[PDB]
Amino acid sequence: MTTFLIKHKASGKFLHPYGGSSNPANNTKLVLHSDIHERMYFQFDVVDERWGYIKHVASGKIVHPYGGQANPPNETNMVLHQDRHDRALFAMDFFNDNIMHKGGKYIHPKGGSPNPPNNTETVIHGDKHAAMEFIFVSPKNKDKRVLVYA
């Protein structure tokens, strides 16, 4: 199914598991990093119309708010975990360019910087601004948007 990079729009860095492993342990944090390789490729498993799991290709683990809450508060870390459940549902809003968790909050770089350094953690946060925007691009062309829903 269609593979993509999650690119932070303001800085051009990508979502990675911290340490870049092909098999990250449960609860490894998701960070921003400039490197491109097969261990930062993602896919999107549609569950219910806009909602689905954001899946790390190399390991098959998916994105979760740490602790798996329905309504994680601001600053909750994004991590990878093997479990599938409704608290790991996100919508990939490719029109407003953001990623929304089921509870209504978004993925941010921690600190909200438009230029986070390599290995900055990502967190849940309710705010909307230029620095929490993400676009979904081809592994072979980091400037070409791809359709994550098909």
Swiss-Prot record:
- Glycosites: N26, N74, N118
Superkingdom: Eukaryota
Q: Where are the transmembrane segments?
A: none
Q: State what protein this is by name.
A: Galactose-binding lectin
The annotated dependence of activity on temperature is: Hemagglutinating activity of the human erythrocytes is fully maintained after heating at 50 degrees Celsius for 3 hours. The activity is partially lost after heating at 55 degrees Celsius and completely lost after heating at 65 degrees Celsius for 30 minutes.
How does activity track with pH?
Optimum pH is between 8-10 for the hemagglutinating activity of the human erythrocytes.
Q: Where does D-galactose 1 bind?
A: H16, G19, D35, I36, H37, N119
Q: What else is known?
A: Cleavage of the collagen like domain may decrease the agglutinating ability and alter carbohydrate-binding properties. The function of this protein could potentially be regulated by proteolysis in vivo.
Give residues annotated as binding D-galactose 2.
N27, H64, G67, D83, R84, H85
Q: What applied role does this protein play in biotech?
A: This protein may have potential in cancer diagnosis and treatment. A synthetic analog of this protein with enhanced carbohydrate-binding properties may be designed for the purpose of constructing a biosensor for cancer diagnostics or anticancer therapy. May potentially be used as an immune modulator in mammals, because of its effects on macrophages and its ability to promote secretion of cytokines.
At which positions is D-galactose 3 bound? E75, H108, G111, D127, K128, H129
What free text does the record give on domains? Contains a collagen like domain, which probably promotes oligomerization.
What tissues is it present in?
Highly expressed in mantle and to a lesser extent in muscle, hepatopancreas, gill and hemocytes.
Q: What is the effect of changing H85A?
A: 5.0-fold decreased porcine stomach mucin-binding activity compared to wild-type
The entry's function note states: Galactose-binding lectin. Binds both alpha and beta anomer of galactose (Gal), but has a stronger interaction with the glycans having alpha Gal at the non-reducing end and binds beta Gal weakly only in highly branched glycans. Has high affinity to Galalpha1-4Galbeta1-4GlcNAc. Binds N-acetyl-2-deoxy-2-amino-galactose (2-deoxy-GalNAc). Binds N-acetylgalactosamine (GalNAc). Binds porcine stomach mucin (PSM) with high affinity. Binds galactosamine. Binds laminin, bovine submaxillary mucin (BSM), fibronectin, type I collagen and gelatin with a decreasing affinity, respectively.
Q: What is the effect of changing G67A?
A: Loss of hemagglutinating and porcine stomach mucin-binding activities
* Subunit composition and interactions: Monomer in solution. Homodimer in solution. Exists as a monomer in solution when a low concentration (0.001 mg/ml) of it is present. Homodimers start to appear at a concentration of 0.01 mg/ml and tetramers at a concentration of 0.1 mg/ml.
The reported effect of H129A is:
2.3-fold decreased porcine stomach mucin-binding activity compared to wild-type
Induction per the UniProt record: Up-regulated in mantle by challenge of yeast P.pastoris reaching the maximum level at 12 hours post challenge and recovering to the original level at 24 hours post challenge.
